[PDB]
Amino acid sequence: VINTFDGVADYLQTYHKLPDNYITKSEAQALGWVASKGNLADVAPGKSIGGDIFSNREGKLPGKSGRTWREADINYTSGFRNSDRILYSSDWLIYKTTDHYQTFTKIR
DNA sequence: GAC
Numbered sequence: 001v002i003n004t005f006d007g008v009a010d011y012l013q014t015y016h017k018l019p020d021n022y023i024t025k026s027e028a029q030a031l032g033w034v035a036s037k038g039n040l041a042d043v044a045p046g047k048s049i050g051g052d053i054f055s056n057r058e059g060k061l062p063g064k065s066g067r068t069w070r071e072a073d074i075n076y077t078s079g080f081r082n083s084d085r086i087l088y089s090s091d092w093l094i095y096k097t098t099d100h101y102q103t104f105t106k107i108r
Numbered sequence: 109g110a111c
Contacts, residue, residue, distance in 0.1 A: 025109095035111060054109055071109060081110045100110055 003048050005074050008086050009094050009108045016092065018072055022050035038080035048076040054087055060104055067091055071101075 002011055002019045011019045023031070023044060032043040040049065050072025054061075061069060067089050074084040074096070087095040087104060094108035 038111095052109075057109090069109095073110095083110060085109080087109095 001046055003074055003076060005084075005086060005096050005107065008072065008074060009096075012086070012088050012094060013092065013108055018050050021047055022072055023047050024051045025049055035081075040076075040081070041078040048073045049081065050086075054101070058101075060101070061087060061089075061095060062093060 001021045002008060003021065008019065028040060028044060028047070028049055033040050040047070051070055054069040054071040056063060056069050069087055069089050071085045071087050073081060074086050075082060076084075083100040084098050085096070085101065087097065093106070095104040096107050097104040
């Protein structure tokens with residue numbers, strides 16, 4: 001399992017994809033995940049939510065026509081989800097936020 | 109796009 005900021009940032013930079021322990025919300029939902037129940041670790045052991053589109057509506061991240069942003073959970077082990085997310089663009093800019101997309105730091 |  002790889003779910004730390006540096007670990008995921010390195011993997012993303014090297015392989016241009018999230019490591020195997022990530023599943024999208026749709027995939028998680030298909031497995032029986034119910035947000036209000038905080039049951040992810042029970043329906044998908046050792047998995048973290050990741051890979052969904054981040055719309056960047058606040059414009060806090062660098063924007064450019066045709067650039068798509070995606071986000072993935074970081075530091076998730078169990079229970080309800082946290083505030084830690086890695087943000088990555090189609091052109092491989094990588095950012096982190098620890099406050100649920102309120103502020104971001106460039107890390108790769 | 110924690111819920």
